[PDB]
Symmetry: D2
Subunit: 456 residues, 4 copies
C-alpha cells in the first residue's frame, strides 16, 4: 500500500526531447514498427532492459576520475578484488567485460562433452555457452514457475525431487554442475529462498556435485528473502548476500545489473585449480587476469556500486518501484505475469490482444502501440524473438507472448511509472483497436533485432 | 489537477544518509535549533534555498570538461556572450561570479548620491548596493502584493500610478533607474506581466528614465506569462523571454537560479559608455571582463544551462512541482502564502502556531520541528532574520512570520514533495505541540546565521 | 637530430609517489624480482605496455560525460560507426570490448578446419584464435625482419615470393585469408610499406584470397610511410590511412593502441554475409552489435580518439619520442633492436649481460634492475615469457632475450625518457654487476605473470 | 646544472591547433599586434599569466565530482577549513571567489582613513583596495629589490630600518597593518626570508602593529627558503609554510596561484572580532561565509590542491622549470631580470631592442614578435600597461620596459620551454629587425587590454 520515496537526490540529469505523438508515429513507422530499431534519442522512457542502463552515484563518478589504467597491479583491481572477496566471500575473482564473458570462461572450464548441467530455468547467453561446450541443459525448477498466473512466492526455487531424480538416472559423475540463478529471469524475475539454496547445497554436497550461481541479480533476490522469508526479517542485506553465496562453489556475475554500472562483470571461484586454468583462458578472450577487458576506472566504479547496492533503503525502493508499476496495472485488470519480479513487469500480450492470433505478433504490436502512445520503449519477448525452426523453417510458438517493461536502477521516478501505466491502461481499454502485424522484411539471423513490419 | 512527469531521466544521483529521528533530534540540538547551523550531510531534503543548488545536465557536465581557462580570449566566454546576446538580446555582457557581483557593479555605475531607485519590492543584496552608493529605495509595487492571503495573479506588477507620482514629486532627473524584478522574491516568487513591463517602459522611455531588470528568475516569470497572460498561450518561452528584455536597458543576473548552475552570474546593458566603465570596474572586484571571477568551465556550463532553461517542458514541470507542494498543503488547511510562487512555498508560521507570540520565534521553531520530524531543512523568514533595531536595540517585528520551503531545480521528485508535505500536515494537526524558542546565544551580526536557541 | 615539442598542453596530471631507491629495492624483493608483480602505485614510469595506458584529451573526457547507455540505438554507436566508415572506409563495423574480442569473431567466421592463414609474423592472441579455429599459421614476412641488428626500413613487409609459393604449394582455396599486421609487433614495431600492401592485394585479388588487417597500430605505420616512402612526403596521415585500408577486406582493431583510449576495439568488413554472421556471433561473446561489450561513453571516446590520432604533429611527436629514447641508448652503445619501432624500444638482454647465460634469465634480471635503479617498469620478453615445452617440459630458448620499454601515448615527456635512458646507460656501464636469477616459485600457467625469483 | 623530471604523469591533455607562421602573422594582425586580443584557441603556449591556468590532478577532478552544493554546512567547506587550519595554522577562514575578494574585505575591515599601510612593494588589485579605503601605501622593501640587474637573494625582504623609521615618523597607531607579500611579484617573483619574517614580526609585535600576508605564492616562497636559507635544508615544505604563517595575524590568498586551482581564494585571521565583522561583509560581496561565492566542488579542489602543493618534488620542479627558461636565455646573452623568480621570467625590452625608444613600445612589439615567431603568448609590462597620466594626459614612462613570460603550474614541459627560449634567442640575434609600434586605436580605460597598434 505504501511506496518509499527515492533514498537519494538527483545529482545530474539526462535531458530528453519530448516529441509529439505525431512525431512518434512517424518514427515508429520508419522503424518498421520494431522498437529495437528506434533511436535512443527518440525515446522518453527506455524500458528495453535493466542491463547497463543504471545511473551511477557521485561517488562512483569520483572513482571514474581516479582510474589506474596500469596493465597489471592496478589499484582499482585490488579495490574490486577486496570488495568482492569481502561481500561474496569467494576466494578468487577474475574480472570480465560482461557476464557472458564469465559464462564463456566457466563453461569452457567446468563442462566435459556429454555431461549435464541442471538449473532453475535458463538465460540465452548462459545456456549457449553450456551447450556450446558439449552439455545438455536440464531444467529442474518447480513446475509452478511455469504458471505465469500463479501468484506464489519464490517461484524460482529448484525442485529437489527433480534434482535427486536426475542424479539417480544419470549419476553424479555426469552432472558438470548445478547452475542456480538468482533471480530467475525467465519466470519474470522470481526469487529463490535461502532454504532452497541451503537444501540444494546439502544434496549436491553429498554427491560431490558443483554449484555455480548466475548471480546477476542477487541483491534483488536478497531483498525478497529479507521481505518474505521467515527469520530474515532482521538480517541485513549484506549478511543475506554473504550466506547466499556460502552454498555456492563460485559464480558468474553481470555488474551491469545489480552492481549499478554500465559495463562490467566477473567470475568467482574457490577452487585453485580452476582459478589457475581460468587465468590462462581469460587472457585470450577478455584480457589479463588483472583487468579482464575492463578499464581500471570501471573496476573502481563496479567495486563502489556493489557496496552501494547493499544499502537496504536503496534495494527496497528499487524493487517496490517495480511493484508500484505492477500494482497500478493489476488494479485496472491488465494481464501481467505474477507475482511481479524484482527488475521488470511482463505483460501478457495474448490476454491483452485476444482479437489477434500469435501469428499476428501481438507482443510486437503491443510494444509498437505502447511507444506511439507514451514514448516508452519495451521489449517484445514472444513469437518474433522466439524465432523460427531451422528444420521446419517455421515460427516457434512460445508459451508466453509477452512484452517486457524492464526498469533500470535509479533512472526513473514514480511519475514516469505513472506515464507508462496510464498509457498501457488506456491501450487496454481499447485493446480491440490494436492491429496485427506482418513481416515486410525478416532477416535470417537476429530477426527480432532488425525485422520490419506493417499493419494487417 | 494534473502534474507533469519529469521531462528528463536521472543520469547520476547524490547519495544521502537517512538518519533516524533520534539522531536528527540530537543533531538539531547541537545546531542550537537553528537550521542554518545543520551540516548538509545530516539533511535528507534541503529546501534552504534554490540558489546554486540545481542539478546540471550531462551536456553541462561535458562542457565542464572543456574549460578554456585562458585569462583572455577563452572559448567559453565567447560561447556565453553569444548565447546571452541571442537569448536576452542585450548588446554587451560582463560576467561576474554571482548576481550580487553584478549589482555591486551596476550600482556603482548608475547611481548618484541622493538619487532615487524605484522598483517592485526588493532583495537584501541588491537594495544594499543601492543604498551603499547613496540612493533612496522607493517601493512602487501594487499594494495587493503585500497581502499574503490575496490569491491574485501577477502580484509583482508595478503600480504605474505610484511610479508616475514619483516622477512627478521628484523629477525624472532624480531617479537613477527603475529596478524591475522578475519574479518578485519578497512576495513569495510572484510574476510580473508583460503588459506591466511594456507600460512601465512606455512611461520611463518618455521621461528618459533607465530600466534595469533583476532577471535572476526570469524564466519562471516567463512561464507564468505563457500560462496566464492572454495572447501568450501559444508563444514560446524563448520568445517571451526575448520580449521581456526588449523593455529594459540592462539587467543583473544570478546564474545560480534560472541558469541551472551552481555558481555564476552576469551584467548586461546596451549603453557603450556604461559598458566601458563597467569593464574598468570589474577588474578590481571580480576579474578581467573576459571571465569576471568565473572559471572557463563555469561560463560554458552557464551558457548551456541558460539554453536548457528555455525548454517549455522543463520550466512547466519546475513551476508545477512547486505548485504541487502548495496544493497538497492547502488541501489540508495548512496556512501558506498565496498564490504559490515559482520557486518556493511559504508557510505562515503566525497562523501555523497561534499559541506562540512572535517573540517566541514561531517561524524559527516551526523550521526546527520540520527538520526533526522529516529530515528536511527549511529557512526561517521572520523575526529572527529581520534582526533587531540598531537604535532601540530591539527585535524588528516583520509583517510576515514565515518558513520558506525553496525548491532547487531538477533535484527532487514528487515523492520527495510528499515527504515534506505529509510531515508538515502531521505537524499542523498537532501544532499546539510546537514549543517557543529563546536565544541562548545571539551574535550581533548575521544572527540568523549563527544564533543558537533553546525551548521555553 | 631534432625532436618536436609536445603538440598539446597538459590538462590534468596523475600524481605519483617518488619512493626512495631503498624502498624500491624492498618493493622489488617483495614482488619476487618480477616486474609483473609490482603495484602500479609504486611505479614512477610504467613502460609495461602501450595498451590502454594512453592519455585522453579534454574533448574525449567531455564525450565521456554524454554516454547514451541505451542497449540499442545509442548516439555514441552512430558516432563511432560514422567515424570509422569515414576514416577506414569499410562498409560495416562491429564494436568489441577489445581487439582479441574482434579476433575471436573473425577467426570463427573466416576459417575452416585444415585451411591456412598467412601473415607477416604474429601476435599471441590473434594466432591463438587462428589455430583455435582449425588453421595453420604460416609466416611470410621477409627474412631480414628476423635479424634484430639489421637497420633496414619497412622490415614488416611481406615476402611476395613466400606468399606466391604458399598459394602454389597449397592452393588458393586452402588459404582462409592473409593476416597483414601494421605495424609488426614481434619485429619491434616495424612498419609495412604501402607498395607492399598494394602488391599483396593485387596478388590476393587475382586468386580471390581474403585480406584482413590487424590494424592495432595502423596510425604509427602511416607515419613511417609518410616519413620514409617515396611519393608520400606530402600526403596527409588521414589520406595514407584511407589508402592502406583500401587494400583490405576488413580488419580487427584494438582501440587501446592507436585510438587513444583505455579500452575498446572493433571488427570491420565489407562483405554483407560476413557482417550478418558476425552480428549473430557477437551477441553471445561481447554483447549486442549496437555496443559490443562497450559502454556508450567508451564508443564516444574511441570515435573522438581515432580522429585525434590523424593529426600529423601528434603522431610525429609520438613516434619521435620513442626514437629519442632509442637514439640516446644507441649513442651510448647500449644494445637494442634496430631500427626503433613506433611504440617501443627493445633492449638486447643477451648482449647487455654477456656474463649471464639465458638460463639465468638475463632479461628478467635486467628488468628488475631497471626498476630498482630508476623506478620505471619494463616487461621481460625472453625465456621466462617463452615458457617451457609441454612435452619435453623444458624452457624454450627464444632467439631474442629482450626487455621491452613500451611507451603509452601522450603520457610522458622527454625528461621522463631521460630518466629511463640515463638509468639504463648507468646500468650498462656496470652491467657485470647485474646478477642472475633462479625460480623460487614457477606457476604452471602464465608463469611470466606470477613467477617469483631470487638471485643466483 | 640539473633539472628534475616532472614528478607526475600526464592524465589528460588539452589538444592544440598548430597553425602555420603565416596564419599566426595573420592572426597577430587582426589582433592589432596586441597579444591580449588573441584568441586562446590560436595560441600554442600561453604564458600570459600563472593565475588560474594551472593543471589539476586526477584526485582534484575526483573531488570535483562530489561537490556538496548546499548553501550552508557543505562538506567541501569543512574539508577546506580543516586543511587551511592545519597547514597555515590560522584560527578562522572565510572563502572568497578570488584573492581580490579577500583583499576588498580585509581592507574594509582593517583600514581607517588617513592611516598607513606598509609592505614590500605592491600589486594592482591589493594596492587599489588599500587606497580605495582611505590609506597611504608606503613601500619598505630594500632598495636593491629595485635593481633588476642585481643578482641578490631574497630581494623581497623588508628593510627593517625603513619600517622602524616609519613607526617613528608616523606612530604605530597610524599604521593600519604591515602587508608582507610572499613572494614579491613586482620584482619578478622574489622570495622573503624566514629571518626577515621573524624580524619584522618581532618589531611589529613590540608596537602592537598588525601583520597580514599576501600569501598567493607562499609555497614558491617556501621552496626558496628551503633551498637558500641556512638551517632549512632539512625542513619540510609543510613545516616551512607553517612557521612562515606563525609570524602573521592572517592573510589573503588567491588559490588561482599556489593552490593549483582555476578559481578560488580565501581570507584567514585569528582575531574573533575581525572574523565576526568579516562574516557580515562577505555576504553582500561574495556570498555566505559558508561558500563565499565558490561552488562546493571548487572548495574541495582547493583543499586537495593546497595539500598537493606541499610535495617537495612538485614545488622543486615548478621553480626549477622557470629557472631553466631563465638559464637558457641568460646563456645566450638575452637581457632578463635577475634573479629568476619562482613563477616568471621578465625580458628587458629596453636592452632587447636598443634601436627603439620607449615611445615606440618595444615591449609590446617584442611580445607581438614572440607570438608570430613561436606561437607563445606573453604579457606586456611596460609603457602601454603603465597607461598615461590623468592630469598631463601623457604616457607614463615606467622604469622597466619588460615582456613577462609567466608559467602556469603543471601545464608545460621543458620541450615547451625550449620552444619559447629558442624563438626568443633567434629574435635577439636579429633584434634590429623588430619594428616600432604606433597606436591605431587607444581606449581610455584598460588600454593595454584592447588598444590596437601598427608598425611604424
Ligand atoms: C543479463 C544476464 C546474464 C549476463 O549477460 P550480461 O550482458 O552479459 O552481463 C546472465 N544471466 C541472466 C539471468 C541475465 O539476466
Ligand atoms: C538570489 C538573488 C539575487 C542575486 O544573488 P546571488 O547569490 O548573488 O547571485 C538578486 N536578486 C534576487 C531577487 C535574488 O533572489
Ligand atoms: C594489442 C594487439 C592486438 C589486440 O589485443 P588487444 O588487447 O586485444 O586489443 C592484436 N594484435 C597486435 C599486433 C596487438 O599489438
Ligand atoms: C594574483 C595575486 C593577488 C590576487 O589576485 P587574484 O586574481 O585575485 O586572486 C594578490 N596579490 C598578488 C601579489 C597576486 O599575484
Amino acid at each position: 500500500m505504501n511506496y518509499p520515496a527515492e533514498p537519494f537526490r538527483i545529482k545530474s540529469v539526462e535531458t530528453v526531447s519530448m516529441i509529439s505523438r505525431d512525431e512518434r508515429v512517424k518514427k515508429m513507422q520508419e522503424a518498421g514498427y520494431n522498437t529495437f530499431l528506434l533511436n535512443s534519442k527518440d525515446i522518453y522512457i527506455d524500458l528495453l532492459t535493466d542491463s547497463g542502463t543504471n545511473a551511477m552515484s557521485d561517488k562512483q563518478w569520483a572513482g571514474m576520475m581516479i582510474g589506474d589504467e596500469a596493465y597489471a597491479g592496478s589499484e582499482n583491481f585490488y579495490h574490486l578484488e577486496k570488495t568482492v572477496k569481502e561481500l561474496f566471500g569467494f576466494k578468487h575473482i577474475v574480472p570480465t567485460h560482461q557476464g557472458r564473458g564469465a559464462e564463456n570462461l566457466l563453461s569452457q572450464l567446468a563442462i566435459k562433452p556429454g555431461q549435464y548441467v541442471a538449473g532453475n530455468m535458463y538465460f540465452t547467453t548462459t545456456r549457449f555457452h553450456q551447450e556450446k561446450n558439449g552439455a545438455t541443459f536440464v531444467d529442474i525448477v518447480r513446475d509452478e514457475a511455469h504458471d505465469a498466473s500463479l501468484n506464489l512466492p519464490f517461484k524460482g526455487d529448484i525442485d529437489l525431487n527433480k534434482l535427486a531424480t536426475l542424479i539417480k538416472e544419470k549419476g553424479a559423475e555426469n552432472i558438470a554442475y548445478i547452475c542456480l540463478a538468482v533471480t530467475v529471469n525467465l519466470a519474470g524475475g522470481q526469487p529463490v529462498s535461502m532454504a532452497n539454496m541451503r537444501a540444494v547445497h546439502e544434496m549436491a554436497s553429498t554427491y560431490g556435485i558443483k554449484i555455480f550461481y548466475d548471480a546477476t541479480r542477487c541483491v534483488e533476490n536478497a531483498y525478497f528473502i529479507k521481505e518474505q522469508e521467515a527469520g530474515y526479517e532482521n538480517v541485513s542485506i549484506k549478511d543475506i548476500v554473504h550466506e547466499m553465496f556460502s552454498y555456492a562453489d563460485g559464480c558468474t556475475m553481470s555488474g551491469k545489473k545489480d552492481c549499478l554500472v554500465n559495463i562490467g562483470g566477473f567470475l568467482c571461484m574457490n577452487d585453485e585449480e580452476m582459478f589457475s586454468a581460468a587465468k590462462e583462458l581469460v587472457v585470450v578472450y577478455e584480457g589479463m587476469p588483472s583487468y579482464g577487458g575492463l578499464a581500471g576506472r570501471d573496476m573502481e566504479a563496479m567495486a563502489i556500486g556493489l557496496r552501494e547496492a547493499m544499502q537496504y533503503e536503496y534495494i527496497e525502493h528499487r524493487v517496490k518501484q517495480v511493484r508500484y508499476l505492477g500494482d497500478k496495472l493489476r488494479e485496472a485488470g491488465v494481464p501481467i505475469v505474477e507475482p511481479t519480479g524484482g527488475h521488470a513487469v511482463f505483460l501478457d500480450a495474448r490476454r491483452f490482444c485476444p482479437h489477434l492470433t500469435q501469428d499476428q505478433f501481438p507482443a510486437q504490436s503491443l510494444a509498437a502501440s505502447i511507444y506511439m502512445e507514451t514514448g516508452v520503449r519495451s521489449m517484445e519477448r514472444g513469437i518474433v524473438s522466439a524465432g523460427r525452426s531451422k528444420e521446419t523453417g517455421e515460427n516457434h510458438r512460445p508459451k508466453l507472448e509477452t512484452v517486457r517493461l524492464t526498469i533500470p536502477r535509479r533512472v526513473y521516478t514514480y511519475a514516469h511509472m505513472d506515464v507508462v501505466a496510464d498509457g498501457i491502461i488506456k491501450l487496454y481499454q481499447h485493446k480491440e483497436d490494436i492491429r496485427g502485424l506482418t513481416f515486410v522484411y525478416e532477416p535470417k539471423q537476429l530477426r527480432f533485432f532488425t525485422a520490419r513490419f506493417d499493419f494487417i
